[PDB]
Amino acid sequence: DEYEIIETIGNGAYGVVSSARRRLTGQQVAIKKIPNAFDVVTNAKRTLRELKILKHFKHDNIIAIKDILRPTVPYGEFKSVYVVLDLMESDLHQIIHSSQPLTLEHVRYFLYQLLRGLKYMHSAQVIHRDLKPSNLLVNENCELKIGDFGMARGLCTSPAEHQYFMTEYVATRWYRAPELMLSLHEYTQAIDLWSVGCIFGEMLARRQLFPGKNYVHQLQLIMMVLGTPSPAVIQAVGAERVRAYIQSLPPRQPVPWETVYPGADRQALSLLGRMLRFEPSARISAAAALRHPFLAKYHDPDDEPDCAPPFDFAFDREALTRERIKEAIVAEIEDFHARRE
Ligand SMILES: C[C@H](NC(=O)n1nc(N)nc1Nc1ccc(Cl)cc1)c1ccccc1
């Protein structure tokens, strides 16, 4: 055979995977099994989206497909997909919430890598929409790689999907941007920068910034630090009940970040304040955040590429049956092997 299994291991971005090694080279890899991959439309579409996205990117701070196993059995019998990935022993969740060191320099280095990968991803017109410490994989050499692209979308989405109307269900509550919570009809790469700010804050205090218990409590926590949202953002709130709830509340001023995180690094808090804004268009971009004095130690524009050409989500807006999706996944596996040799 081509690979030798070592052990079943946990993974922040993809759950249960197998640590393995290539028999000829001894190279360590992670092997992810997607069992019964073609049984449910929503799961099958997600597998296709993830394969396409990961094949499009070629960046050290984004998880790479190292190999995809070809069907060894008849087409009709091909039911499970095996993807060979970079082996990542940990993730930012496990590091932050452990007894491991996490100095300002760890924060600065992890933030840098995350923003480096985002700058490249964002130039490809891809919004991750689910950034959280658990899907930011970290290996033994301290390399951070963004994983778990199931929630990723472009600047344009199909009305046929439920999330197009129900934005407050997009991704993880604790990292979910105000435009998603409130349906502000402005959904860009700025969604990711709110999540980055939440992650940045979490590394600084080694605790979640807005750990909301439910929908309303999540907004309350955000408002406790950011203050009452402006009249223009309140008018942009889609739902009348939420809009009335926000308007019913007494006015509140923003709490300076120097009060949220007492004695924290000045340049860190400066960049943090540029990320955590109610208004999507007021947030700093990944590219400009890389130009902030806080990351100057690592910042090198010649070593921080963009992704050309942009990624197209058109294949995902198509209404395809489970069989047609299986056909497209099988074509992706073939294309992967054809492009190598
Ligand atoms: C969160 C995880 N799901 C998961 O990894 N999925 N699910 C689908 N449809 N596709 C993938 N992963 C995937 C697809 C392509 C590539 Cl290149 C890499 C990974 C899960 C783990 C255990 C139990 C339930 C869910």
Residue numbers in the entry: 53 to 393
Sentences from the paper on this structure:
The ERK5 protein, which is encoded by the MAPK7 gene, comprises an N-terminal kinase domain and a large C-terminal domain containing transcriptional transactivating functionality and nuclear localization and export sequences (NLS/NES). ERK5 is the effector kinase of a canonical kinase module comprising MEK (MAPK/ERK kinase) 5, MEKK (MEK kinase) 2/3 and ERK5 itself.
Compounds 4–6 are close analogues of one another. Compounds 4, 5 and 6 bind at a different binding site to compounds 1, 2 and 3. This site lies adjacent to the ATP-binding site. As observed for the complex of compound 1 with ERK5, compounds 2–5 bind to a ‘DFG-in’ conformation of ERK5 in which both the hydrophobic R-spine (residues Leu106, Ile117, His180 and Phe201 in ERK5) and C-spine (Val69, Ala82, Leu144, Leu188, Leu189, Val190, Ile251 and Met255) are intact. Compared with the structures of ERK5 in complex with the hinge-binding compounds 1–3, however, the P-loop is pushed away from the αC helix towards the ATP-binding site upon allosteric inhibitor binding (compare the grey and coral P-loops). Differential flexibility in the P-loop amongst kinases has been implicated in the selectivity of certain conventional ATP-binding site-targeted kinase inhibitors, and may have implications for the selectivity of our allosteric ERK5 inhibitors (see §3.5). In contrast to the P-loop, the αC helix orientation is unchanged upon the binding of compounds 4–6. The side chain of Lys84 is displaced by binding of compounds 4–6 and reorients to form a hydrogen bond to the backbone carbonyl of Val68 from the P-loop.
